[PDB]
A paper describes a structure:
By using a combination of heavy atom and molecular-replacement-based phasing strategies, we determined multiple crystal structures for Xenopus (x) Rspo2Fu1–[name] (highest resolution 2.2 Å), xZNRF3ecto, zebrafish (z) ZNRF3ecto and mouse (m) ZNRF3ecto, (highest resolutions 2.4, 1.6 and 2.0 Å, respectively), plus complexes comprising xZNRF3ecto–xRspo2Fu1–[name], mZNRF3ecto–mRspo2Fu1–[name], mZNRF3ecto–xRspo2Fu1–[name] and xRNF4F3ecto–xRspo2Fu1–[name] (at 2.1, 2.8, 2.4 and 2.7 Å, respectively). The crystal structures of the ZNRF3ecto–Rspo2Fu1–[name] and RNF43ecto–Rspo2Fu1–[name] complexes revealed a 1:1 interaction between [name] of the Rspo2Fu1–[name] and a single ZNRF3ecto or RNF43ecto chain. The first, extensive, area of interaction involves hydrophobic interactions interspersed with hydrophilic (complementarily charged) patches contributed by the first two β-hairpins of the Rspo [name] and the region immediately carboxy-terminal to the β3 strand of ZNRF3ecto. The Met-finger at the tip of the second β-hairpin of [name] nestles into a pocket formed between the β3 strand and the αC–β7 loop of the ZNRF3ecto, which is lined with hydrophobic residues (I95, I191, V192, A198). The acidic region of the β3–β4 loop (immediately adjacent to C104 of the disulphide bridge) becomes more ordered in the ligand-bound ZNRF3ecto structures, probably as a result of electrostatic interactions with a positively charged patch on Rspo [name]. For all ZNRF3ecto–Rspo2Fu1–[name] complex structures we determined (from five different combinations of species and crystal forms), the dimer found in most of the unliganded ZNRF3ecto crystal structures reoccurs. The overall assembly thus comprises a 2:2 complex of ZNRF3ecto–Rspo2Fu1–[name]. The 2:2 complex resembles a crab with the ZNRF3ecto dimer forming the body from which the two Rspo2Fu1–[name] ligands diverge, without interacting with each other, as the pincers. Notably, the β1–β2 hairpin shows less conformational variation in the liganded ZNRF3ecto dimer structures, always maintaining a tight embrace, consistent with the Rspo2Fu1–[name] interactions contributing an indirect stabilizing effect on the dimer via the β3–β4 loop. For the ligand–receptor mode, our data define a generic architecture for the interaction between the Rspo ligands, and the [name] and [name] transmembrane E3 ubiquitin ligases that is conserved across evolution from fish to human.
Rspo (R-spondin, also roof plate-specific spondin) proteins are evolutionarily conserved from fish to humans and have well-documented roles in a broad range of developmental and physiological processes resulting from enhancement of canonical and non-canonical Wnt signalling. [name]/[name] specifically targets these Wnt receptors for ubiquitination and turnover, hence reducing Wnt signalling responses. Direct extracellular interaction with Rspo proteins inhibits [name]/[name] activity. Here we report a molecular level analysis of the [name]/[name] ectodomain structure and its interactions with Rspo proteins.
Residue numbers in the entry:
A (entry chain D): 39 to 143
B (entry chain C), C (entry chain A): 53 to 205
D (entry chain B): 39 to 141
């Protein structure tokens, strides 16, 4: 059950994703295969590309989700979000919210 | 034009510091898309769709990898980012010391591969098919690391 | 016996992941201590007092490397742990896919290698000298990483 | 020219350390040349090999200085050594002495 693909195989996993789904190259050691994804994993975002709908890297260091390459929307676990970027410790003149992992005045 | 002799080496770092190794053997042929030279390197598979210039920024690979690329049934990508040729170039540009397409699913690649003999790449390009192609993917699929060794006799 | 064609290759990756390369070419001879094959890998310099089986154990190297071993005036290593052949066997063991000896300051090594009393390794044992040697070491000496490509024709 | 050294070389650093000091193959990328030390660095120990007296790796992990391949005198900063071994956080059965970083 390779899931979400129009085309598929044991050797390349999924390929040429179904409908509006997002194509995502997973890699383990030498092996690499396709995945026709719904909501891309940490570090990536659904991007509408020339070839096809494919999943791309969230530029921002330490980041879990983007709406674009260069603006983080959900920072990763441990870290605090501020103005696109992601921080371990909120910058001078700013104070933490452990609840929202957000950052303030 | 000439037969390519592929040795697929499995190894283990023995606790003694030394290394043990298990050689497998295959044959394919050198495309005139590419140099008629031997080569060797850590094998890396690439999905064919991984080989688009389209991506502004991709993953990095350590320089010297022997790409391995299972071509798909022609009718499963309507238009590619690039032609098989084009993709080999990507590989080599991305640090591929050589590229080895499993051509079983699509032979025409061959006529499209050998079509650019005028402007050949610095580095070997080779195909495999049939049982020789299956063995390759059996190792590529089930093992953690393997080094490829392509010789031009 | 045969001439061995070595390309030392410097490489850098641009931030797109694309690789540019600088390639220096040298010449040496295959020894009869080692098979008559081409081979390529990342280069690893080894001090010759670093190739003794003696020690309980050593530091581990990633498999497939190309050993490059600048011999010194024999008076500066008067009683050696093993034969140069023997130190070749010790590098293969530890993973070398090939060995290259700058015998420039010790041609006696040249002569030891080709008349092996010890059975011949199944990987290439090449040696160099003069400018070729000199060239090789200038790179090795002054750079962090380089890939070698030895070629039999 | 070279420190602690009988013989020398651009390419192979020190060769055959003067016996009083210890021989340390050091590694810089693909480079490996002889160094000739007073005393071996973190994780190595003086040792008389058949051919010569060369720094060697302490069998014991994290352990800064040895007397033997397997017996370890001191453990590196932020660690606790006793009876030859060395452990991150002093193991149950005893009490740390952070002044001697013991266990
Ligand atoms: Cl390599």
């Amino acid at each position: 059950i390779c899931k979400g693909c129009l085309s598929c195989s044991k050797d390349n996993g999924c390929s040429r994703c179904q409908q509006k789904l997002f194509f995502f190259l997973r890699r383990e050691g030498m092996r690499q295969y396709g995945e026709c994804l719904h909501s891309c994993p940490s570090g990536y975002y659904g991007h509408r590309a020339p070839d096809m709908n494919r999943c791309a890297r969230c530029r921002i260091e330490n980041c879990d989700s983007c709406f674009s390459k260069d603006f983080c929307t959900k920072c990763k676990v441990g870290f605090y979000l501020h103005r696109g970027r992601c921080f371990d410790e909120c910058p001078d003149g700013f104070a933490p919210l452990d609840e929202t992992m957000e950052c303030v005045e | 034009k000439e037969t390519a002799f592929v040795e697929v080496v499995l190894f283990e770092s023995s606790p003694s510091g030394d290394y043990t190794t298990h050689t497998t053997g295959l044959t394919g042929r050198f495309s005139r898309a590419g140099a008629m030279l031997s080569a060797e390197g850590e094998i890396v598979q690439m999905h064919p769709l991984g080989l688009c210039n389209n991506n502004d920024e991709e993953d990095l690979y350590e320089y010297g990898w022997v790409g391995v690329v299972k071509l798909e049934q022609p009718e499963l990508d309507p238009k590619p980012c690039l032609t098989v040729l084009g993709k080999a170039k990507r590989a080599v540009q991305r640090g591929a010391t050589a590229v080895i397409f499993d051509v079983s699913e699509n032979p025409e690649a061959i006529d499209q591969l050998n079509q650019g003999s005028e402007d050949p790449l610095k580095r070997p390009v080779v195909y495999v098919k049939g049982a020789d192609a299956i063995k390759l993917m059996n190792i590529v699929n089930k093992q953690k690391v393997a080094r490829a060794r392509i010789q031009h006799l």
